[PDB]
Each structure stands twice: as structure tokens, then as C-alpha cells.
Amino acid sequence: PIVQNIQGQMVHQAISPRTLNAWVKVVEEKAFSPEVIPMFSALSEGATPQDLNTMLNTVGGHQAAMQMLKETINEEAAEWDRVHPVHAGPIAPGQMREPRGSDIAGTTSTLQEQIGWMTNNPPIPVGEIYKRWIILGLNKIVRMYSPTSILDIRQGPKEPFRDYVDRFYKTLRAEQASQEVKNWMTETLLVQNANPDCKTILKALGPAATLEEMMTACQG
Amino acid sequence: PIVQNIQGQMVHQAISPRTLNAWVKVVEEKAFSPEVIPMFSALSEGATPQDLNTMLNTVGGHQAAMQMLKETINEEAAEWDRVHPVHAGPIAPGQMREPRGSDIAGTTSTLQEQIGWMTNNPPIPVGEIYKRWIILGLNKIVRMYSPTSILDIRQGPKEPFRDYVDRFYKTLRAEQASQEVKNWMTETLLVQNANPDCKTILKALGPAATLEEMMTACQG
Amino acid sequence: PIVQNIQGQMVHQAISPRTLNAWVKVVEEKAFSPEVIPMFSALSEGATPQDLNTMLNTVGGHQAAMQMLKETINEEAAEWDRVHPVHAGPIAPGQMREPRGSDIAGTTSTLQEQIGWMTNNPPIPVGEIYKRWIILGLNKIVRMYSPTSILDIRQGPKEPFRDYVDRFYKTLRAEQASQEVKNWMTETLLVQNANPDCKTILKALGPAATLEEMMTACQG
Amino acid sequence: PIVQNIQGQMVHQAISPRTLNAWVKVVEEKAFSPEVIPMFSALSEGATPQDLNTMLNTVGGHQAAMQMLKETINEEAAEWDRVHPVHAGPIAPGQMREPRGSDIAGTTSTLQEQIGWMTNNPPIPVGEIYKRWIILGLNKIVRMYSPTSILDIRQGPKEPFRDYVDRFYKTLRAEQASQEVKNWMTETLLVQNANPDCKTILKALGPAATLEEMMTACQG
Amino acid sequence: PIVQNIQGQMVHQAISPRTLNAWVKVVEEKAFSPEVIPMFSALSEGATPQDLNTMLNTVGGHQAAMQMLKETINEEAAEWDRVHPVHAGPIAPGQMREPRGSDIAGTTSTLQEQIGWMTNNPPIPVGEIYKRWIILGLNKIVRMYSPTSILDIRQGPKEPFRDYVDRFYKTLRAEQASQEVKNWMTETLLVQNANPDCKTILKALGPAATLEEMMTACQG
Amino acid sequence: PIVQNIQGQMVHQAISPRTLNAWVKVVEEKAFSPEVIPMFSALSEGATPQDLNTMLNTVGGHQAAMQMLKETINEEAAEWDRVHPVHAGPIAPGQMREPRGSDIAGTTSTLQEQIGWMTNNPPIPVGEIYKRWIILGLNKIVRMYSPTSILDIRQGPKEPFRDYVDRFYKTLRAEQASQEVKNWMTETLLVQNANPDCKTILKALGPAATLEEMMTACQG
């Protein structure tokens, strides 16, 4: 990737095998979860788009999500070339060409062009935009891979409350809902779809119950 | 994490993959125990708020504990903002603004802001404050995750005394309380739930004696 | 491979033992997956023909595939020698001789000659051409290694649509086709060889629908 | 710990997570062996007292040994405070204050104070004294862990001499005795509790013989 | 191994412990395979004769093969000394003496001698000659360790054709012979010991046909 | 240990935990073999005597060999202080004291004295002499650990020849015999203690048989 030396001038570095090996291993073990996105954002930090493309191509299995993220990249590139037209025809000497929809991903562009683009003054955050697009794609993927809806979460007659609320927060974290509606529903749907005795206990305790109080009361 | 080193201190390195991978593995194998608190304190010695956010987001499972930790951090940030109000009006040029209650959690701040706040003269230990917040959250988590109470610890007819006192001290360390009452409770509970042989041995020895003599008395 | 020292001259670094061991182990683990070609492409970034030959010869097993790729290498070298003439005479300083097919293959070349050919101005991409030939041979072998045909794979009565589309994309990646017509298969046959219920669902929704919405409709 | 950069000034480098991981793994697999104390001595080469505190706190289980070593640390700190008076007043530049037992332990001190104390002229070996106290506590713990006394081991009728002398030395490495008397012990108890036939063999050969010839004679 | 790099080339580094451990593991698990010669050629790329001796001394088991390798190396060194006699009389000042037959094996030489021999102008590649000796010895070892002869390889009624030709080519690579007979023996031995159906298929295809068509003919 | 920087000036470095863990694993898996002496010589190359002392003290089990190597170290130190008398009473300014029998091992000498001795001009190879003494001690240990004498090896009526000659060469390499007598007995004891039929077959070939002939003829 990209490393910073104590001198001040940075150079290009090839992709290390350890990072891609760890990525493949965590994809195999952790098939799909909300945690795969922060780990991907922290592992591919400061990397060329070719490195991210190779990481997305070396993963074995789950080709549906790969096609989904590829279509998302294509749509984002189309929107980019639609909203950013090429008004300047000629190119000034010493300046490189502007990254287009197919060049921002690295399909028809070599590594030297990406190096010259990211090392410009001022730099062009092509890698950052590509990482943001991949993060949006992974968000869409983990939203699609939700086992069930948040409304369909109902505690059974004998199922404990710990695993119930765990699955509730798990299926709520992967939902694409905003923070406001999530904070609004986490105070109502948690108590309305609980064990009847524990539900009545929590309702009689008061309308200002917190997490620890509910955990201590619902288990008694 | 931020690195203070020889000339060229203006550098920022992301979290190493090995560290976060080992953290995920140990929080997976060791789901929740008071051992994880010194581990987190050592793995995040002088780390950035974004690094701590990534470390808290990389752990998979146990969403209830994460929600409790988040709400404790929010409550403590609100308390800090209440006790440390922000000054109104224009800020002085060249003087960095004091970190707000929400800026400590890193939810509405950027990397350059915390970099300038940590490398200021004098430095502002916001990272240490957030680490203390996470430590308090983990304390509350390991206190609410206790399956058996400290009082219910009673040594059986065949359970060894060493394993009994080890379990007792582990349960005592799992709970957080003032040491001034801990000194009394350990003495009023250790010599009461032992085997009859060890009980009469410690009665013949003396209550005000040390612990090593009690360990070497009823051994074997 | 070839690396650049910090503020130094271009020097040649030896083969990576850890990378070679990782490759020889990942071969055994994933004996033949479609990702082995991107894996080799990422592990052989800027590698020398001698290192590539050693990495090919160090693999245990798959001797039939090794013989096939060697035959393809010989055919490519013969085609290169036929399309590019060979000249002889005195070797002037600063200019290298005309590389022959056996010189491109690296069987009758040496390390110093390879370094002189790859570090010339302009550089002769002998290693790049050899890597392209190797990945083309691997593509041929993985196309021959296709168990189920793209035109022979059909969704069963009890086979889930997720596994169906996964195997469909795997067979599409494993078969041979051009980039332009590649979309025609995944656009037509994917809906023409599916279950009748989801066929009617997609026909009622619209053929222009994307994979995400068509799968969310076929699941419901 | 403390390291010296090449042609640089003495700077304090952060702790290594792999060191703590190896430490916790070796204390988990090898719960309490005689060699774990040289292991700790080699892992804590030139480390700050905070590093040793974190390393001791990161250990999972065996809280009785932790309480015992904490009591020994408190006793050593009290003895140091009693033997070394404490003075107060203005702190002159270039000279540090009188370290107190609570400061030697590192429980009520910070990092910058320890750094200034260890990098002063002349250096105050606070970390060395703390490491000596910790290894003395570990010696006490490993002596308490010894199940069999030095005088309680005797060679059986069917037990070979190799395993006998191995267990004898393993028990001697965990007893409480000085080297001067340890020499006499390993000289006389080895022949006093041996096999009668090999006893007569060694008496005919001579007590001043080395262990090699004694073992070769007892085997034959 | 020798390190040819930027200014400061006068340096000799011992074999890395990780590479030696990997070699020990690949020798212990895979005692002898036709792919161990490329493994040795890659792990010992540009190494001093002392490093090669240390690698050959750390082998576990198979002492007869090591004795065969040693006697073959001695015979080849004697042949080299016979074909390259050493000049008598005083040596010229400043000119390094030519390596003798026994000096190549490193049995009567030191480290400084071989360092000066490999770093002379022009360099004397004695390490490459010793590596050739070692790989010839390994070829003799793997040819002697052949459990079943090449002629006795016959495909059963149920064994697949791909695995059959893989085993055939593996056994052919394990044996070292001239190139002008192998291409004839493979053609005169493969199309005779196949399945009756595959035999009729290849008889319907043609003897002078390629191998890929034979592989894709009787597949499945 | 001791590392060489690119600048030219070397500094002291603490013992890495990875090498110590590797040594412990080698000792645990392979208790004692004639091949571990080269492993120790290549792993502890250029290390301070304190590092070797810690490595010899961190080993778990087989304390007989540890006592043997300690006695050999003591005997070598006694011989050193006997053959090297201290004829110079006073010490010149700027010169360090001469290493005595107890100082050459590091019992009553700190690490700073060893660093000053090894970095002197000219350097005093204390570490090299200590490594040679440890190598001699390990040689004595592996000689004592020999299973039986070379004469006791006799091939049974049904025991194969491969394992027979393997054990023969193993106990020959583990034997303290010189190079001449080993080559003298390897031509006689191998043919005189074999299977009678294969013995007569090998004797009918002649007195100029090689190892490959002995292997290929005795198996027929």
C-alpha cells in the first residue's frame, strides 16, 4: 500500500500477502456481518484501487455479492461521469488526464497513472472515493443479507430474553434505517414483543427504563 | 495510534492488522472476563479515538453489551459537558478549541481535529479519557455478566481449597467496589464457606492471620 | 522481484520464502479455485522469469496441468520467435540483443541477463509477457476444469435461488466468453433457466430490474 | 521498554502486543514452571513498571498468586520507605525528587515521571528494583507450588535412574535454599535416596565422581 | 546468504530462523517428493556453502540418503579437482587462489575464504556449483527411492484418467532421463495403459494428436 | 542479539521472544538429536552470553543435560583461568578488566561489561568461546544419549534393510568416533550385520560397492 517514511517523501509499495491472506481468512470465517465493513475500511486504508480490485477478485465464493458491488461501482461511475462533464478538451503540459468512470476504478488504467494521480499537488482522492463506494456497496450487501425484518422479531414462550435482544440488535444494526427511527423503535418494539411477565414488569417499572434495568428485571 | 518518536513526529499510522486480528480472536475466545480490561488497556496504549472506535466496531456478537457500553459513554460525555461548559463567542486565533463532550467519542469529529488536540502544547489527554470511559463500560459489562453471585460461592465436600479461593478471588475481581469494604468482606466470607477440616484448621490458627499460611495449612 | 530502495538505485531482491510457502500452501488448500489466477497475479507483482519458473516447479501435483501450461508456453514462444525476427552481431553498450522465444521463456537465460533486460531504457517487459502467458495458461486450465456447463446448469425444484445464482456465476466465470457477450448470458439465461414462480415474478416486475431487486422479489 | 535508535536520542518506544500474547500463552500452557521466571526476566528486559503491571494484570486466573505478589510488593515498598527517608521542597531542573515506595510500585505514578526518572543522570533503576521484587514474588509462588519436598523423593524399585534424577533436580529447582547449601544437597541427597544396587556402585566408584560417569555406571 | 545491495555490500548474514524452520517442517512432513528440488533451489537462492552445509545438517531422518548425497558430492569434487588441477608454486599477491575440490564443500575452508571468493572480481560461482551437486544428489535420491517402477503403472477400471495421467507425469518427473527419449516413452506408454473406453476413444482420435484433446475427450 | 545497521555502527538489542519460543518448541518436540546443535549454533549466532544463559535456564525438563553442560562450562572456565594467569596487576585507564572463569560465562558480570568487552578494539570473542563450549557440552550430551554401542546393531531375520541402515547411520553419527574409524567401519559392519541372503548377494558383487548398489541389491 502507501507508507510514510521519516524522511517525508513517500513511495509506492506492492500489496503485502499477509493483508490479503487475512482478508480471505476473515471472509471465510466471518461470511457476512456488520463488522466486516470497519475491518475492510481499516485494512485497505491508503491503498491503490488496483489493490482493492485484486482483493475483491481473490475472494472465493459469494459471487452474488461481488456482482452486486460491481454493478454498484458501475452505477456510481455512471453518475460521476454524468454529473462531472469534460468541459476542458485539451490537456495542459505536465498535468494528467481527469479520472473518468472507467478510470476511477482501474479497469483500463495502469498503475503508473493511479500513482501519478494520487501523488499530484493537490492530490486527487480517487482511492478515498473508491473506498466510500465499496463501503456503500457492503452496506447494501449486509442489508440484503438480513435474515428477517425488524418487525418480525418476536420472543417465544420459553426463549430467553438475552438471545432475543441479541438477535434484535443484530437485525437492527444491519437495517438501513436512520438513527432517529432506530432510537424511536428500540424503546417500543423491545418491550412490546417480550415475555408477557417480563413485559408487565418492565411496564410497571416505569417509562424511563434503561438497558441495565431491563436486563436485571426481565431475568428475575 | 499516535507515535511520539525522533524528529519527524508529524506522522499518523493506522491500526496494524495483527493487533486488531488478535483483539478479535481474543474477544471471540474469551467472550467476557475481567482479563479483557488490562488486555484492552495494553493494546490501546496511546491510541487515537478513531482507532478505539474501530476496535469497538470490529468485535462481533454480544450487541447488548456494546449498546450498554455506548449508552454509558454517552451518559459520561453528557456529564462531562455539564461539568465542563464550552465558552461562547469567537475563539482566539492560534488556540485550539477545547474538546466537547461529543468530540471525545469521535462521532462528530475528524482525524485532524484530534491530531491537533493531542499534539497541542500542552497536550489534551482526550484519548486517556475515552480509554477510561471504555474501561468503566467494560467494568459495568463484566459486573452485569456475572452468572453466580459472590455470596453463593461455597466449597463442596470434595472441591479443593486452592480452586475454591481461586474462584472466589476471580469473582471478587470481576466485581468493582471500594477496597475499604473489600478488605472486610474477603475476611468475613473466605473463612466461612470452606471445608470443615479447613474451617477448624483456620479457627485453630487465627482469623487475623495472613492468606499464605491458610493456603499452606489445609493443602493436600 | 524488483524493488526500489529509499533514495537508492534500483536493486534486485531475492525470492520471498514466506510468499512461496503461502502460495504452495494455498494451492493445496484451494486445489483449483477461479481465484488462484488473481492470487498468483497479486503474489507475482514484478517477479522475474526465474522466480516464476521456480514457483511453478515447486508446486506438488497437477503435473498434467504443468505439462499443458509448458506446452502453451512453448507455443507462445514459437509464435513470438516467428513474428519477431532475430538479429546477431556485436552488442553495443546500453542496448541489449533481440530476445528470442527461449529467452522470453527463461529456460536458456540467466539472472544477470534478465536483470539487464528488465532494467534497460526502455525496459523490455519480458517478465510481464511471461506473466501474461502464465495467466492465459491458467485461464485455459481452469476453463477445462469446469465441471458443470453454463448451458447445462438449471435450477432444480428444491434448489434455492441463492445457490442457483451462485453456481450460475461460478460457471460463467469458469467458462470461456468475451467481455461484450458476457452480459448477454447473465441477462438472458439467468431468467430463462430458473424456477417458474420466480420466472413469472421477474416477468411481472420487469426485465430491466437489477440483481438485488430481482433476488429480493424471488425470495419473497 | 527503552530502546536506542540508530544515531538518535534515547526515546521510549511503545509496548509490543505480540510480547504480551506470547506471555499469556506461555503462562496458560505452562501454568507454573521453574523456568517461567527466566521467561518473565527475558520478556521484561528494560521495561517500565507500567509495562510489568499491565503484563501481570493481563494474566487470566491464578488471582491468589496475584494477591500474594501484591502483598509482597506492598511490604517491599513499606520497607523501602522506612529505610529511605522522603524529602519535599522545590524541584530543581536536572535533579528528580526522592522516589517513594508507592512511586517505585508504580500504582500512584504516571508515565512521564517514570521516563524522567529512568533517563536521568545518574539513572535511578526503579524498573530494575521492581523487576527484582516481581521475580522474588514469582520465586515465592513457584516454591509454594512445589508439591513434593526435596527430602520426600525416593527412587522406587521399578523407576529408572534417569527419571529419578530428573524429578530430583526438578524438585530442587523449586525449593528454598541457597546455592552453597544447594551444592551439598545435590551432592549427598542424590546418592542417599538412590537405588541400593546403584548406591553400592557409586560407593565403589567414589562420591566425588561427576554425574555423567555415575549415570553411565548406574545404567550398566 | 550473500546480500548484493546498495553501498555497504560487505556484510554476511546467517540463515534466517523462519526459513530454516520451514525447511525442517517441509522435510519432516514431506520426507521426499519430486518437488523438493525446486523448494531447495528457491530457499537457498544465492547462499554461502556454510549455509548449505548447515541446511544439510539439520535434516531429520533418512541418513542413508544423506550419506549418498555426501559420497556423490565427494566424487564430483574429486572429478572437478582432476579436471581442474591446482597450479603449484607461489601465488601472485592480491590474486585470490582458485578454490580446490574440497574447498567447494566447505569441509576444509572458512567463512572469510568463501566470502572473498564469492565477492571477488570477477566472482567465482562456487555456490552455484555446490547447489548443482546437491540437486544432482537429490535427483539420485528420488530415483533410488522409487517404490513402483514406471512400467507397472496401469489404470484401473474405476480410477479416473486425469488422476492416472497426473500420477504418470509425477513418476516421470521424479526420474531424470534424456529429453530425446521421454517424449517417445510417454506417447508409447500412455495410450496403452488406459481404460478400454478411453483406449477406443484415443484410437478413434489419433496417436499423433495433442494431450489436451485426450484430456477433454474421455472426461467425465 | 547483535545486528549490523546500514550506517556501520552496531548497537545492543534485547533477545527476541520469537527465537526463544522457537528454541523451546524445538526442545519440546525433539528432546535431543545430533541435529539440534547446528540449530542452536545458527539460532544464537552473535548473541551475548546472558542471552545464552537465559535460553539454557528457560528450558523445561531434562535437567540432567543442563547439569552436565553446567559442569562442562565450569571445567572449561577452570582450565581457562589455569592456563591464562593474571600477570598484569594494575589496569590501564580506558581498558576493561580481563574476563576470568566466572566472568566469561556471565555469572558475576553485568551486561554492560559484556557489551564493553565485545565492542572493544580489538574485540574479545567471549561469545564465540562460550558458544564453542556449549557446542562441546551438547556434543557430550548427545554422545551420552546414544541408545547403544555400534556393535549391538544386528539386522533381524524379518527386519528390513532400509530402517536397519538408517538406525546404523544414526547411531554412527551420534557416536564419538572419528572420521577415519567411521569410514573404516561403514564398509565392514554394514555388510557383516545384514540379512544372510542379501549379505551373500552383496559379497558376491565385490569390494567396491557403493551406497546405491547396497540399497538396490539388498532389497531384491
B contact test, residue of D44, D52, D57 with most B CBs within 10 A: D57
For A216, C190, E135, the CA distances from B142, given in Å and listed in that order, are 14, 51, 60
Asked if residues E128 and E101 have their Cβ atoms less than 8 Å apart, the reply is no
Test the C interface: residue of E43, E182, E216 with most C CBs within 10 Å: E43
- Gyration radius of chain D's alpha carbons: 23
Sign for the CA dihedral angle at A26, A32, A34, A38 comes to positive
Nearest CB to E68; choose among F19, F173, F211: F211
Nearest CA among E219, E164, E157 for reference residue E191 = E164
Of D33, D43, D212, the CB nearest to F68: D212
CA C7 to chain centre: 34
Task: Verify cis geometry, omega within 30 degrees of 0, for the bond prior to D147.
Answer: no
Task: Give residues preceding each break in chain E, C–N over 2.5 A.
Answer: none
Query: Which experimental technique did the depositors report for determining this structure?
Result: cryo-EM
- CATH number, domain of C102, equals 1.10.375.10
User: Using a CB-CB distance cutoff of 8 angstroms, which residues of chain B are in contact with residue A18?
Assistant: 17
Q: Chain D closest CA to B185's CA: distance in Å?
A: 15
Q: Considering only the beta carbons, identify the residue of B14, B59, B71 that sits closest to A35.
A: B59
Mutate to test the interface with C, among E13, E21, E215, E218 (most CBs of C within 10 A): E215
Query: How many CB pairs below 8 A link D and F?
Result: 63
Question: With contacts defined as CB-CB under 8 Å, which chain D residues touch B46?
Answer: 14
What three-state secondary structure class fits E210?
coil
Strand partners, C3: C11
Residues of F in Cβ contact (< 8 Å) with D34: 60
Interface of C with A (CB under 8 A): 1, 4, 6-7, 16, 18-19, 22, 30, 33-35, 38-39, 41-43, 45-46, 162, 165-166, 169-170, 173, 186, 210-212, 215-216
C57 neighbourhood in chain E, CB within 8 Å:
35, 37-38
Q: Which residues of B touch D13 (CB under 8 A)?
A: 5
Is there a contact between C107 and C43 (Cβ–Cβ < 8 Å)? no
Q: Please name the residues in contact with F38: beta carbons below 8 A apart, sequence gap of 6 or more.
A: E54, E57, E58
Whether residues A54 and C42 touch (CB distance < 8 A) is answered with: yes
Task: Please give the Cα distance from C19 to B218 (Å, whole number).
Answer: 57
Q: Give strand ranges (E) for B66-159.
A: none
* Residue A123, phi-psi category: left (phi > 0), alpha (psi -120 to 50), beta (remainder): beta
Determine contact, residues F118/F124, Cβ cutoff 8 Å: yes
What count of other Cβ atoms lies within 10 Å of the Cβ of residue F13?
Answer: 15
Measured CA to CA, the distance from residue F68 to residue F81 in angstroms comes to: 20
Copy the grid coordinates of residue A109. 488504467
For strand D10-12 and strand C2-4, is the pairing parallel, antiparallel, or unpaired?
unpaired
Domain containing E59 equals 2-145
Dihedral sign, Cα of residue B11, residue B15, residue B18, residue B23: positive
Chain A: residues touching B (Cβ < 8 Å): 4, 6-8, 18-19, 22, 26, 30, 33-35, 38-39, 41-43, 45-46, 162, 165-166, 169-170, 173, 210-212, 215-216
Chain D nearest-CA distance from F204, in A, is 39
Whole-number Å distance between alpha carbons of A169 and A153: 10
CB E212 within 8 A of CB C68: yes
Pick the closest to residue B196 from B154, B163, B165 (CA basis). B154
Is the sign of the CA dihedral C166, C167, C169, C170 positive or negative? Answer: positive
Residues paired with D12 in a beta bridge: D2
Nearest to C71 by CA among C125, C118, C134: C134
CB burial string C123-162: b at 16+ within 10 A, e below = ebebbebbbebbeebbebbbeeeeeeebeebebeeeeebe
Of residues C59, C54, C109, C53, the one with CA closest to residue E42: C54
- The total of other beta-carbon atoms located within 10 Å of residue A82's CB is 9
* Single-letter amino acid, residue E46: G
d(CA D41, CA D128): 10
Q: Is the CB of E60 less than 8 angstroms away from the CB of F35?
A: yes
Quote the cell numbers at residue F8. 556501520
- Name the DSSP letter for residue F5: -
CB-based contact C58 E39, cutoff 8 Å: yes
